[PDB]
Amino acid sequence: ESQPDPMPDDLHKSSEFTGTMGNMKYLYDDHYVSATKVKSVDKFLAHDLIYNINDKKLNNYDKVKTELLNEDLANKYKDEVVDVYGSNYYVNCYFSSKDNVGKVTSGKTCMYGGITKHEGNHFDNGNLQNVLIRVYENKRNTISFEVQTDKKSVTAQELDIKARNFLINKKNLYEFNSSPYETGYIKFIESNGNTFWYDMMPAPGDKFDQSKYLMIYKDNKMVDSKSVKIEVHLTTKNG
Amino acid sequence: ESQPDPMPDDLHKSSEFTGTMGNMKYLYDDHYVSATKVKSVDKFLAHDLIYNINDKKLNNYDKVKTELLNEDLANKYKDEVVDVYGSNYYVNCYFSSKDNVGKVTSGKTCMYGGITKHEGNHFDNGNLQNVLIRVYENKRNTISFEVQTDKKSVTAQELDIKARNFLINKKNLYEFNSSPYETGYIKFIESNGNTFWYDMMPAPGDKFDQSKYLMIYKDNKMVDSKSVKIEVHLTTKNG
Ligand SMILES: [Zn+2]
Ligand SMILES: [Zn+2]
């Protein structure tokens, strides 16, 4: 039922990415859209939902569009009061068919998934759940830290974003020019036996497409915060 | 992330099962445990939960034990008000360490999974959701029918039980001595892209172990009733 671990050549090597690593760092360093108790107002294409989410701090947007895997997954959340959490982008972000290619977008932002039902998804006493992350550097458990969440069923996105944010500060996961690591993947292990992973490095080439990379969250995958296990496996550029 | 379709030899052939097919038929023909708004009262082993569920019609039991994949999945539902639906058995059903091998059990019954949270899992107007089942006989769509459920997030077990029950009556899926079909599998396709299947035929040999066969529900797998697709693929013994 689950997805097997990555083989040597299934992973992206950072040395084969000749572009700016700061484009990857931008997506995980204190960067996220967070909304509370909202309902869908409109749709652009059949598989997406548009929301009226305003940026409090920077005020870079007042409307958010999130793409889902298909029409079915979108219509499931169309008229639901939900909470939103995910990594947004502006380059090649379209809300209408009259938008040209290369659009940088003004007060609107785009993202994938990051949707959870509001009703019945929070802890009884208004507490926060601690999720433990185990970090492996060259098959050696160097450090372990905890991220928090107010959700019982949380998207894999929220946990991954919070895990990378910490790693950028503590271990310099992503820097402007490059990365101290050659390969890296975040693996999720559910209490129902299901496992899956995400490639933490950008595809080979001199260009980085943010909207193409964030498609890994399109499926809106969720995990039980109390029982899920998370492992980050990294390998240094040296040895 | 998902499970690939079965290869020719991944499936059980009914001609290689020299036992009584009525043992398989017994588990799906108007046979199921159904409970409403209950909470766990005790535990036998670390991965299971015992409930006070009484049989209304036949009164064959007043206590039910359901086994889950592990301690984590069990402790998740330990203090939750839940609804139960699944296929039960009595042969080799133990509730204590003082139970001998081959126990037929009196007023107690055993099952796997079949657990869903009660709060926030029912349709707004008190309606029932119709789930369409597509039947393929020798790669040919012969018939299509609908099963019903009062749950938004239903276990794969409840749907499979209801699908087989209909097929036993309409197509004689399982009979006492044998089966008109050589192979058969029920495939689930989720709106999140995940797919998985179950083998509908008993393992080769002259003996049928009901408790070993029902372990396919141990993981307590659930699907979104409104968007899930179900396909039953069968092959006749002839051609
Ligand atoms: Zn909420
Ligand atoms: Zn209920």
- The first and second tokens of residue B68, run together, are 């889950």
What's the gap in Å between A83 CA and the centre of ligand 1? Answer: 5
What one-character DSSP code corresponds to residue B16?
Answer: G
In chain B, what residues touch A70 (CB-CB under 8 Å)? Answer: 191
Those residues whose C-beta lies under 8 Å from the C-beta of residue B149, and which sit 6 or more positions away, are B128, B129, B131, B158, B159, B225
B125 & B184 share domain: yes
Which of A66, A86, A119 represents a domain boundary (last residue)?
A: A119
Technique used to solve these coordinates: X-ray
Sign of CA dihedral B152, A115, B186, B28: negative
Q: Cβ(B204)–Cβ(B107) under 8 Å?
A: no
How far is Cα B230 from Cα B220, in angstroms, rounded to an integer? Answer: 17
Q: Do B123 and B144 touch, CB atoms closer than 8 A?
A: no
DSSP one-letter code for A21: T
Same domain membership, residue B190 and residue B204: yes
> Residue A158: helix, strand or coil by DSSP?
helix
**Could you tell me which of B188, B171, B64 has the C-alpha nearest to residue B132?**
B188
End residue of a domain, out of B119, B147, B169: B119
Query: Using CA atoms, how far apart are residues A228 and A131, in angstroms rounded to an integer?
Result: 8
Give the CATH number, domain containing residue B53. Answer: 2.40.50.110
Are A68 and A95 part of one and the same domain? yes
Asked if residue B214 and residue B140 are part of one domain, the reply reads: yes
Whose structure tokens read 């509908």?
B200
Among A106, A88, A87, CA closest to A96: A106
Give the burial class of A37: count Cβ atoms within 10 A of its Cβ; 0-12 exposed, 13-18 middle, 19 or more buried.
exposed
Which residues in chain B have Cβ-Cβ distances shorter than 8 Å to A227?
72-73, 75-76
3-state DSSP call for residue A34? strand
d(CA A49, CA A112): 10
For residues A202 and A93, state if they share a domain.
no
Whole-number CA gyration radius for chain B: 18
**CATH number for the domain harbouring residue A130:** 3.10.20.120
> Which amino acid is residue A204, in one-letter code?
P
Residue B90: Cβ-neighbour burial (10 angstroms; 0-12, 13-18, 19+): middle
Which residues 6+ apart lie within 8 Å of B71 measured at CB?
Answer: B46, B47
Q: What is the residue-wise DSSP string for B47-110?
A: TEEEE----SSS---SEEEEE-SSHHHHHHHTT--EEEEE--B-TT--SSTTPPTT---SSEEE
**Partner residues linked to B42 by β-bridges:** B50
Ligand nearest B85 Cα, by number?
2
**What residue has token string 């059949």?**
A46
Measuring CA to CA, which residue among A72, A25, A35, A40 is closest to residue A56?
A35
Residues B128 and B233 in one domain: yes
Strands (E), chain B: 33-38, 48-51, 63-67, 82-86, 108-112, 115-117, 129-137, 141-149, 153-155, 181-189, 195-199, 222-224, 229-236
What whole-number distance in Å separates Cα of residue A34 and Cα of residue A84? 6
Distance CA A127, CA B25 (A): 48
* Nearest Cβ partner for A69 among B192, B196, B224: B192
Question: What is the number of domains present in chain B?
Answer: 2
Last residue of a domain, one of B119, B140, B161: B119
Q: Which ligand is nearest to the CA of B154?
A: 2
Beta partners for A112? A67
Tell me the CA distances in angstroms from B63 to B33, B50, B66, B107, B217, one per residue in order.
Answer: 11, 7, 10, 7, 19
**CA proximity to A63, closest of A95, A100, A26:** A95
Expressed as residue numbers, the domain containing A174 is 1-31+120-237
With contact defined as beta carbons under 8 Å apart, do B200 and B171 qualify? no
Say yes or no: A10 and A60 in one domain. Answer: no
Residues A84, A51 share a domain: yes
Nearest-Cα residue of chain B relative to residue A229: B72
User: Residue holding tokens 């928090």?
Assistant: A148
Count Cβ neighbours within 10 Å for each residue of B115-147 and write b for 16 or more, e otherwise: bbbeeebbeeeeeebebebebbbeeeeeeeeeb
Amino acid at B217: Y
